[model samples]
Structure formats: structure tokens, C-alpha cells
Target chain A: MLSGLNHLTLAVSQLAPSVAFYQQLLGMTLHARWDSGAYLSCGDLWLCLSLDPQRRVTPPEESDYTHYAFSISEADFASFAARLEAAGVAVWKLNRSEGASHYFLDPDGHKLELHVGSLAQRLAACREQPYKGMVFF
Target chain B: MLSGLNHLTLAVSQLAPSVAFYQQLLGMTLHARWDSGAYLSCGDLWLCLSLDPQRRVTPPEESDYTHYAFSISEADFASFAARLEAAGVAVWKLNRSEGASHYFLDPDGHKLELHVGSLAQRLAACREQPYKGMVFF
Candidate 1:
């Protein structure tokens, strides 16, 4: 009854620093690892990452309104947000007028996103940049 | 710098029992909703389910090696495990010798999977019928 979005499991409390932050800072391509968890690919999707240190949770230094986003292109979104801020990884930005999306965590606090666009190009960038999470499009 | 899985948010403590377990038991497709969370579309993958009652977690009835699997086919995997066991849910079976794969629990503890194949038919079902989560396929 479904034909897309086939993977997205996450519970990481450790799993090698969340698989090196989704394979060395969101490049994603581990495809399988199992011991506690691992499996990533992301462009045809699949991203499992389970280490479940008793159901981990604590990721919140910034950016909110839930997470899980991927897709990039605005000419490689500022060199991919300057390579996750030169790998110090705590990239944040959540303003939107069809812009600022990037938000990151995944060392356990989970919450990960990176955007170029979708959700119908962010509701057509909210009608010439309108707003409110696009008010149910 | 990535390009797959455009969605997956998961963190439901409430929000109508995780939106009736992902839109009436995994058919997904609410598309959008707010003031807490909702956004389920399974053909283009996007599953948000967010209420986050302070980070919820409390599901476990079986199959635990970390979860999140989906790709149903073998004719929609036994009518999708009989519609998640006629909506009573809690159906488990991860003893894969290269066949079925259905686990459950989406009331909040979060652990859902279905099966048919992909991830290269699950690494050729991990080299022709092997299991234990296919040891790093």
C-alpha cells in the first residue's frame, strides 16, 4: 500500500558517533552494519542507525519544530552549510521564506535536516514566499 | 550534498495515537497537519508523527535489533500482515531465512517494518538466506 520512503529508523545513543554523523557529516552511504545498527544510503533513501542506549534523547542545542529533512541543491546549499561548519557539527538555521533550513544534531539528540526544497518546493516557497510552515500548503 | 529520504520525523507521545499508527495503520497520506504534528505520505516518503510529549518511548513487543524497515511486495506481504493483525497490532516475526519480515509497535515506542525488498533485495537477503540482521550486508 506504499511505494516510497522505505527506511528511516533511528535510536542512536552511540553507534560510532552516529556512524560518523551519517557517514562523515551527512554524505551517507554505509548501507549495512548491524551489531546494534547501521545502514544508510539516502537518495533512494534508507537510513537506519540504531544503537538505542536505552532509548537515547537529548539533542537540542537549537532548531526546532521536529526534524528529518534532506535534499540539497540551492547550488549545494552554501557548500553544504560550509561542511557542517567545518565538521564541528551543530549547524543551525531555521528561518524560512524558502531559505534557511539546515539544522543538525544526530550524535544522539537525533533531529536532522538539510534542505534545498521539497514538500512541493516548500509549498512553492509558500506562494512567492508567504509563510507559516506553509499553512498546510 | 545528499538526496534521498525527504522525510521522517517520529517523536509521538500523542497526536491521536501517532495518527492512528501512521494514518490508519500504515497506509500513510495525511500529507500535512500542525499544532503538534502530522504529515504522512508513503509513496514519496515523509512520515512526521510529532507530538513529542517530552520525547516518548515505550514500545516493545518483539523483534528488536533496532527497527525501521519497509518495502512490501510479495503481494503486499500477506495482506500487510493481515492489516497489522486486524488493527490489534503487535505482530512479530523477524526470523527471516529469506522470506517474511514484519515487526510492529507504532503507538509511540516506535518500531515499524514491513518487507518485500530493496537495499538490493536486502543484500540478496544477506547472501541467500542469512539473518541476525544481515551482519552489515
Candidate 2:
């Protein structure tokens, strides 16, 4: 019924800074911009930063566990983590999962991750060191 | 700095029904399942449904506009729309964008969209008929 993730439309309380967060810091390519929203891309993922009036730009008081992760090369993981910290992005969680993973927040307080592994790699690791009750298909 | 969307981790109140919704209706491949969570894939996208104690299962009474859109074939767009309605998923929004899109609530009430276009296609369409104050880069 579905092909793949075509895009993610993120509601932002403010447009300009959110665009800068994705484009300047995260390095997504800016495709188009308008008064209310902007289109950007990172590889095949199209990200839409929609300016929303009712959206609050506040960080969560508690962890939600929901997040979007972006694939980052293992080679650049440490430096990229440093860069985000230096830029004052809030570190939400430390790496607890397999492979090198860094959890942080976007400008809109959206939980995001920079992960070094793919699904195949994660599956292979799970076979060797599976989580409790983990079952493979 | 980033390659693409590696995965999306969604917090759900119930694991069984949410997994069924993605695996059965959405046709995502089940990678693995555990006590608290499951990993599924739709094309290149890895979707993790995590059972959260704090997450609410209820649908939003108002619009939020934030959503995750999956690409679908234009040929299957209408049929798939009918399938969702037949399954009793709540229709959240009518399409007002350039492509054939159907916005609906998932089992967890996470806003989701089935869209028939890509970023490049959307950009091209914008060139012909731009949204107000739209600027291309």
C-alpha cells in the first residue's frame, strides 16, 4: 500500500530559525521557501518545516521516546556530535542502543537522532546481542 | 552531514494493534518484535513502534498539520484511499496540495499521509504554480 517515507512535515512555531536549524546546521538542501513553510532535502528524505500558529516551541518536560533519526557515517559521528553541542543543541539522551547514536533536539524541540547503523546492520547485531524477548522474522 | 531518514520511532499506547496496522494495512515488513517494541520497514524507511506508558492513544480533536507522508503509486491512490475508509481510519484532512494525498490518523492517532509525488515533482509543480511568496533555490 505504501512505497516509502516520502516526506516529514514538521510544525514549527517560528519558520526562520527552524529553517536555519535544518539547512545551516543539519545541512539539508533548501529547495524552496515561502511565507509559511519551506522545503528541504537530506538524501531522499524531503523535510517540510511548516510554520504553525498553535505549535509551541518548547522542549518536553519528560521524554517521549518518539523521534526521527537520520543516517550519519560512523567516521563523522564524533565530530558531528561535537558540532551540535558547540552550536548549543540540547542533548536529549546519550547513546544506549547498538552502534553510535546521538539523540538531540531540533529548534522546535523535536526529538531527532544521528545514527550510524542501517536496518541490516542493526538486525545482525541483534542476532548476536538481542534485546530481551526480541524475535526475528 | 546526514544521509537521509534512517528510522522513525513512534511511541504507541498499544503494541499489538499498532503493529497490525502497519504490517497488515500498510504492508510494512516486520523486521523484529520484542516485549515493548517492534521494528518494521516500509521501503527504505525503518519504523519503530515503541509502547509508551505516557503516550495517549486518542486522536487530536483539532488539526496540528504535522505528519509523516509515505509515497504511493498514483495508480493505487484512489483504491488505497477507499481501503483506509473501509478499514475505519479517521480522515484528518482533505488534500489541498499539488498531488493526490489522503491524510488520515494511524492507530496511535499519529497523523499520516499517503502521497503520490516526490520533492522534485513538487518543486517542478511550484515553478508552474507557486504558493504565495514562494522562492526557489
Candidate 3:
């Protein structure tokens, strides 16, 4: 059984842009790199991104409410949203019965979110909703 | 700033097969489910699998080795690798400067790994590798 998550790797249209987006927006630290991709981390978790031809970017409209959600302190949520807005990324809000989340697209149309609650809090809030298998970060 | 990682979502070929793979092999718990996808958690971290058509699976040979890695206890590494082998997944080994790693291809050609080391070990190993932006794990 898995003890915990180690890292998540991604296939992006372009590597530098993905890396730059992560580094600038999320403060991800570079861990390693090769010709095709790079490893990054902000906490115990690690993120990997690569450029592969078969990998396609899903537009937000087609994203179907699926995205990576990172936990942001409720205190920082306002400023964070402001920065992302100033950057001109298309932003949207999803007010779940459980909690509030902000959704935005990365340069390559990758869906990312900032949720202002813990996973447990989201689950508790969704206790009555039919489970749709969406994990709240 | 960010608190920590919440979850990583993957676009896989089929929902049922991918869900079964994670549940049976990795012991991931199905947190909830919707028609298009399901959320599973291995520990504190979570993984989402999707059957959305826009999500594509990279062929194994065409894979740039961009994949997610899960941490296992040094004690459980052997049995975990055995279980994966028993299930007939493609498994390989990567010997990094700081540690050893096992890499394998998931059913949909998505690469996954069970690494037997820590982040510090990986970061240190990749230090002199000349900023290649990759980790064997």
C-alpha cells in the first residue's frame, strides 16, 4: 500500500512554459531535470512535467470541472486570486455545497484550482451529495 | 503561499479498468465516484482517474518517462514490487546516484513508479546531473 504521495508527473505541450507557470504561480522548487521534463516540489509532494506529442491540452470548457486543486490558506486566498486575475488567466469560481474553489487554466489549458478548505472539510460538506469522486485539495 | 499537495488527476483510457488497477494494486480507496471519473486516496494524498475523451494516454515507447512516483517503506518495497510483477505490469529499474528506483508502465501506457527513497535523496542525486529536469523515480 502507498504510504503517501511522492510526486505527480504531467505531460505538457511545452516544458518551459509549464515549468515557468508552476514556478511563478505556485512557488514550486525545481528538484531535477532531463531533456524531456523537470521535477518540482513545494512541500512533501513533487510535480513532474514533460513535453510529449501525444499529450493534448483540454480546454477549460471541455475540462468538465476536473483540475488539480491546491490548498491555500483562507487568509491568502484573496491575494492569490488577485495575482492570478492580474496575470489575465481566465478565472472562474465553483461554490460547492462543501466549500469554495477558484478554477483557472494554465498556459497550456491545464486546469488548476485553489481551494480554501481542507480535504476533510470538503468531504464533510459533501456528506449529503452523491459522491462523484472529485477530490478536494 | 501553498500549504501542501492535495491531489493529482489523470486522464486515463477507461474509467473502470483504471479504477480497478489503482484499487487492486495500489490499495487506493474509492472516495467517491461520478460517471466520468472517480477519486481514490492512497494515504494523505489523493488521485483522480478520468475517462474524458479529450484525455489521451501516451504510448509506452513514446513515453518521455513523465510519471507519478509513490513512496513505500523500505520494508515494503520487495512485496510491493512482487505484487506488481504478479499482476503483469511492465517493471524496470533505475539506479540513481543517491538511490535505486523501480519504474513501470500502467495499463494505459502511463508510467508509474514505486520509489524506495526520500525527496532529499533524490534532490541530492540529481544535483550534479547538470539540471536535466528529471528524476528516475
Candidate 4:
């Protein structure tokens, strides 16, 4: 059987800038680097930033930012917010009625959200024995 | 710290056709169904196919047909390939000299490659790693 998503490929205009931004801003470790792109790790999720100067696939004009949400503990959120502000990155405060959190964009225009307690909260919201009948093919 | 990728939201034209394709072709189990989206799982990764009739964010025009690859054990490749052909899904044999693999596309036009053995075989010809170490990220 096929396993779950292992990684995602994201095309970036430039490699150095995006690499620096993700590594510094989001605290993603630089697991590996190559001529065309770099590999970054945030926990178990790998983000591949590939550079295609020719723009063969994703056109520059049609590039729409990709949005991804990351879960963080309350303490880590505070630290991340402080680090971003210190680094002069624009941080937007969002109050979505569902909750209050922060939003920011990476150098390559990928939208990211650092939601506080989202994981724990989501787990609590699930009914009792949520995985009772779960099956994997 | 964030543990891993919890889910990925993919904008699709229609939910039913996409859901049917994934469930039948990929062997992903339906995790949950929602009004605006549906969740499917293969192992630990959560795949969210969201319906966007209005084409708000990710427009079809900007879509890139480039395929994404996933690494799997040699044992599972035959069964997966057989199941796909049995279901009448078009499968392309990839000449990735370094590894044994094949290719196909999802309903939304996203390309997917399935391979066996170490990634080194695929990376041998490329300037960088094939997927940029996304597995560890």
C-alpha cells in the first residue's frame, strides 16, 4: 500500500533568499542542500524549495502563494513571535473569531500560520474513541 | 515543537471525482467528509482535498503539471501498480535509470511518481536530491 505524503515540491524564484528566510524565521533545520534547491525540516515535515530560473512549469505571473498552518505550543509561539519581530519581519495579528493568532509570509510568498494550542485543542474536540474504527489500506 | 505535517489542503474543481480517484487509485482511506472539503489518509499523512468552485486562490491556469514523487518499499510497488492498472488508471513507466518506478497524474493534473529503493538512485543524475529531503522536514 502507498504511504502518506512524504514531501511537497515548491518552486521558488531564488534559492538563497527563500532558504535563509525559512531557516531563520521558522527555525527549520537545513537538512540538505544542492545546486538546484535545498531541503528544510520542521519536525517530520520536509519542505523542498526548488529553483527553476527558466520558469518552465509555474509561471511567475501566475504564482499564487501556498498557505500552510503549523501547530506550536504556547511557549514556542511566544518565542517565535519575538524572534520574528526582532528580525524585522512583518507579523500580522489575526482574530478569526475561531481564535486569535498570527500570520506571516515567507520570502517566497508562502503564507504560514502559527496557531497556539491547535493540536491539543483539536484532539480534545474529537469524540471519545475517535480512532476506534479507523482502518488503513 | 510541531511534530509533523498534520494535513495539506489541495484546491480541487470537484470533490466527488477527486475523492473517488484517490480512494480507488491510491488506496487512501477516507478519514472525514466535510461540506467544503474531504480528508483522506495514507499512513500518517493527512490529505485534504478542498472544493473551490469559484477559483478564489489557486486558479486552474496557474496549475503546474509537474509530478511529485513518494518513496515506498520494493515489496509494495507491485501490488500498488497492479491495483492501479486493474482499475484502468493510466500508468506511465518512468525511465529513471537509477531506480524502479512509474508515474501517473491525479485528477487535478498534479503529477505523481512512485519509486522503490534508496533515493540515491534517482538523485544520481540530478544536481540535487529529487525531493529535497522533504521526508525529514
Best lDDT among the predictions, by candidate number: 2
iRMS, candidate 4, in Å: value is 6.9
- Model 3: residues >4 Å from true position, as ranges? A11-16, A30-39, A49-66, A90-99, A131-137, B34-36, B51-58, B62-65, B91-98, B128-137
Write candidate 2's Cα lDDT for B30-123 as tens digits: 9999998999999989999988886776566643677999999999999998988999989888898898999899887899999999898999
Task: Please tell me which model should have the higher lDDT, number 2 or number 4.
Answer: 2
Model 1, which residues run further than 4 Å from truth? A8-18, A23-87, A90-92, A96-102, A105-111, A114-137, B1-30, B33-40, B43-70, B76-115, B118-124, B127-137
| Tens-digit lDDT track of model 3 for B59-137 | 6665444577888888888898888889998864465545546788776776788877776776675665555434543
At residue A3, candidate 3 shows an lDDT of: 69
TM-scores for the candidates: 0.29, 0.96, 0.76, 0.69
> In candidate 1 chain A, where is summed lDDT lowest over 10 consecutive residues?
A91-100
Query: Lowest-scoring 10 consecutive residues by lDDT in candidate 3 chain A?
Result: A91-100
Which docking class does model 4 fall in? acceptable
What's candidate 4's DockQ score?
A: 0.30
- Measured by DockQ, the strongest candidate is 2
lDDT of 1 by residue, A27-71 (tens): 788866766777788778867777765754554743234567887
lDDT by residue for model 1 (B60-104), tens? 742234466767778778887887889888744465535567877
DockQ, 0 to 1 scale, candidate 3: 0.42
lDDT of 4 by residue, A26-103 (tens): 777776666677767677666677775633433223332224566677777778766777877754333231133456
Question: How does model 4 score by TM-score?
Answer: 0.69
At residue A128, candidate 3 shows an lDDT of 65
Clashes of each: 3, 0, 12, 5
Give me the displacement of residue B23 in model 1, in angstroms: 14
Question: Candidates ranked by TM-score, best first?
Answer: 2, 3, 4, 1
